[PDB]
Structures are given as structure tokens and as C-alpha cells.
């Protein structure tokens, strides 16, 4: 019937059911053979979804398991499309090693420059993981900008600042929060340009930001005599003037 790129090529389809028998049927109208469990001549298994045979087929390493989107480019190109990482769910040892010569385990070449396209595609198979905390992401990010001189970028203008905004009628008392305030909007601006904003004044905050109420200024300067790391107190208009000229004004203008 419609082609035989697949003729004399044996396939196991384990998942499915994008549906397990649709694909076996389609394979079958490209000249190709189906087989209920894998064997010494089955070419690859096709893998729509995680599963019992599948999960298991991977745990042995005889076969090499490929996404359904591969067959669908073959069906669409009427051609026998060479395998590309983006296709592989799992690689059998021999094939793994053939592809570890040219490619990363995510699919980036060692030897050929990437691209917008090509890297989007790489990026595109991963979902993470959590293996990462906001505090953690921050430093990693921060050190990479430092490494690469991205640390003056606007959107990163404040990574290195850890800021307490005077948003609580009682310092550090979460239930005294003043809401719907020009200062609520300053927390958003600071965060949007990389700042770490903190609802607790404690050792390690580098900056505290006042607006128009100076009622707690003296508490702050009193707190700060007890700190080791001696935060600055700054006017709200610091943050605006920094963002408006797309780089840090700095601070001694804006003291206190």
C-alpha cells in the first residue's frame, strides 16, 4: 500500500495505546513488520508513554527505544529519516556510543556550532527538577553573569543586592504588612531586575528601602548597630533612577 521505506524492517510498538494499533498499522502500510515483543532483529521499539513492558525493556539494554515522532516524519517525508537524538527515548550500548562521539547526552554537538533553532530543540526535552531552590538558582545565575560579564544587564542590575523593603508597620512582623503601596510596587521592580527581596531584616541584607514614612528609620539604624554586615538605607527613588537609566545610580546620593 502506501510506501516501503520500511520493507524488511521489524518494529516493536510498546506504547501508545497516538494509538498503539494506529502506528502499527501505519508502519505496516510503509512495508514494515510488527512483532509483539523485541528480539535479535527488531530494529527499535516505539514508545508513546511510560509503561510495564517499556520500563522494563529499558532496564535490559538490548534495545533502543525511539519516539513516535520519528515514524511520523518518516510517514510525512516518505523517507527513512536518520535518527537524531531528539528521537531517542533510550539507547542500547552500541548506539549510545556511536552518538556520544558527536553529541552530548541532551543532543548538543561537541563539534558543530548550535543555533537558535537547534538549541531550542535541545532545550525542549528536559523537565526539571527541583534539585533547585530559589536561593540556589540565584547564585548559580549570579556567578554565570559574573563569569560572562552579564552582570550589568538591566534585568540583572540588582542580583547582588538582598533587599528589605519597609513594607511592615512592625519590622519583620509579617502580619503588619502595609498592602497596595508604592512600596509594594518597588518590590516588584526590584525583583523584576534581579534583586533578592526579603520579608525579614536579618544579617546579610545589603540594603533596606524606605519610602515616605520615615517612622521606622531609627529602629533600622538601631537594628543595624547589632549587625555584622551593615546595610545601607536608601531612598525608593534609587531603584527608579537605576531602572530609568538602565544601570545602577549609586547609593550615596540616596542615603537614609
Amino acid at each position: 500500500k502506501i510506501s516501503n521505506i520500511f520493507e524488511d524492517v521489524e518494529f516493536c510498538v510498546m506504547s501508545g495505546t497516538q494509538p498503539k494499533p494506529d502506528l502499527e498499522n501505519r508502519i505496516a502500510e510503509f512495508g514494515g513488520y510488527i512483532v509483539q515483543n523485541p528480539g535479535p532483529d527488531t530494529y527499535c521499539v516505539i514508545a508513546g508513554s511510560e509503561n510495564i513492558r517499556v520500563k522494563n525493556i529499558i532496564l535490559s539494554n538490548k534495545h533502543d527505544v525511539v519516539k513516535p515522532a520519528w515514524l511520523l516524519e518518516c510517514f510525512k517525508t516518505k523517507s527513512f529519516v536518520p535518527w537524531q537524538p531528539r528521537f531517542m527515548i533510550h539507547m542500547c550500548p552500541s548506539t549510545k556510543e556511536h552518538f556520544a562521539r558527536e553529541y552530548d547526552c541532551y543532543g548538543d554537538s561537541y563539534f558543530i556550532d548550535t543555533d537558535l533553532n537547534q538549541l531550542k530543540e535541545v532545550f525542549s526535552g528536559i523537565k526539571n527538577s527541583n534539585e533547585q531552590t530559589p536561593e540556589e538558582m540565584a547564585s548559580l545565575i549570579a556567578d554565570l553573569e559574573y563569569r560572562y560579564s552579564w552582570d550589568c544587564s538591566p534585568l540583572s542590575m540588582f542580583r547582588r543586592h538582598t533587599v528589605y523593603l519597609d513594607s511592615y508597620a512592625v519590622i519583620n512582623d509579617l502580619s503588619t504588612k502595609n498592602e497596595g503601596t508604592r512600596l509594594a510596587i518597588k518590590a516588584l521592580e526590584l525583583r523584576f531586575h534581579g534583586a533578592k527581596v526579603v520579608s525579614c531584616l536579618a544579617e546579610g541584607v545589603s540594603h533596606v528601602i524606605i519610602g515616605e514614612d520615615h517612622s521606622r528609620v531609627a529602629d533600622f539604624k538601631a537594628f543595624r548597630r547589632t549587625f555584622k554586615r551593615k546595610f545601607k538605607i536608601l531612598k525608593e527613588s534609587w531603584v527608579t533612577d537605576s531602572i530609568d537609566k538602565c544601570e545602577l545610580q549609586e547609593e550615596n546620593q540616596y542615603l537614609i
Partner: protein, 201 residues
């Protein structure tokens, strides 16, 4: 216990302003008291729940409707349309007021006023209440105008910041990509060179 001072003109007195003060508890329909004055004298009187009902009955007019008309006549509740007319004899002390529609005049109700004994004094009380009234509404205005300013400056300010932030965020992904590609392809320069030297090794 609401009151309501309203300035009028008598048909008898075209140019001279006159003041009507009504007073009640909170309906008008429950009855009300009703001083007139011109600066210089002062007349009073009382109307009652049922006198009102009778008056309406006389006019063959639905009661809400009628009280409608009373509030608008007596409380400065008048629409653009509405023309109301006020008539008083010092001499007979009779007060009546009417509405004027298709060039007819329609009497809306009447009063028996009783000229008042202490004139310069109720005037005093009256015009203390106005000072208090004007001062309250003044101060509330000063406050509302300041909030209006606050609010208008702060809305203008988030609107701009916000939109500048939506642009920057929408250009971010590609931007990161581009920084990532230059870094990875420099890495790959270094891979190639080491690999070739290993070939020649």
C-alpha cells in the same frame, strides 16, 4: 434627624433671597417642621404624616410619587426640567408652593406659618449649622482632592513601569538564548582544537 436648608425666591419678592429650612426624622413622609426667614424675620410651622396623605389624595396622585415631588420641591431635589414656585404672605402667613408644567401652575401643598418670637436667634442656630456644614464639606474636599492626586500619580506610574516590564520580559527568552549560544559555541571552538591536536597526536 435630617435637616436641609435650601435657598428660595418668593413670587412676591423677585430679587430678595429667602431660606427654607426643613427638618425631620428620616422620612419626610412622617411629617416635618419648616422655618422660613429673610435675614431680618423668621416664620415656622409643622406638617404631619397624614396631612401629607390627604394632600396627595386631593391630587389623586400615588403616594410615593407625591413624596417624590415634596422632596424635590422642599429639599432642592429639582431636575433640569423641574420649575417650582414659592408663595408667601407675611400678612396672612400662608405658604404655598407649586410646580409649573405645560404653562399651568400646579399647587403642590400649603403651610400655616406662625411668625416667630426669637428671630435673630434661630438665624444664629441656622447659620452655625451652615458654618459646620461648609467646614465639613470643605475639609472632605481637601482630602478627596489629595487622594485623587495620589491616585492619579500612582496609577500613571505603575502603568508605565508595567508596560516597560512586559516588553523587556517578552524579549528575554531570545536574549538568554543568544548569550547561551555564544558561550556554548566558544566551548565548541576549544573542543575542536583539542580534538584535532589529538588527531595529529
Amino acid at each position: 434627624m435630617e435637616r436641609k436648608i435650601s435657598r428660595i425666591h418668593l413670587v412676591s419678592e423677585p430679587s430678595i433671597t429667602h431660606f427654607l429650612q426643613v427638618s425631620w426624622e428620616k422620612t419626610l413622609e412622617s411629617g416635618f417642621v419648616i422655618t422660613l426667614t429673610d435675614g431680618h424675620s423668621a416664620w415656622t410651622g409643622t406638617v404631619s404624616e397624614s396631612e401629607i396623605s390627604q394632600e396627595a389624595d386631593d391630587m389623586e396622585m400615588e403616594k410615593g410619587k407625591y413624596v417624590g415631588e415634596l422632596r424635590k420641591a422642599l429639599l432642592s431635589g429639582a431636575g433640569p426640567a423641574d420649575v417650582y414656585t414659592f408663595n408667601f404672605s407675611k400678612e396672612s402667613c400662608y405658604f404655598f408652593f407649586e410646580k409649573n408644567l405645560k404653562d399651568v401652575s400646579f399647587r403642590l401643598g400649603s403651610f400655616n406659618l406662625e411668625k416667630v418670637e426669637n428671630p435673630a436667634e434661630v438665624i444664629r442656630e441656622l447659620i452655625c449649622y451652615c458654618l459646620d456644614t461648609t467646614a465639613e464639606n470643605q475639609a472632605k474636599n481637601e482630602h478627596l482632592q489629595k487622594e485623587n492626586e495620589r491616585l492619579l500619580r500612582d496609577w500613571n506610574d505603575v502603568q508605565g513601569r508595567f508596560e516597560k516590564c512586559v516588553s523587556a520580559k517578552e524579549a528575554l527568552e531570545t536574549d538568554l538564548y543568544k548569550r547561551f549560544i555564544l558561550v556554548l559555541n566558544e566551548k565548541k571552538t576549544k573542543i575542536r582544537s583539542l580534538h584535532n591536536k589529538l588527531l595529529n597526536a
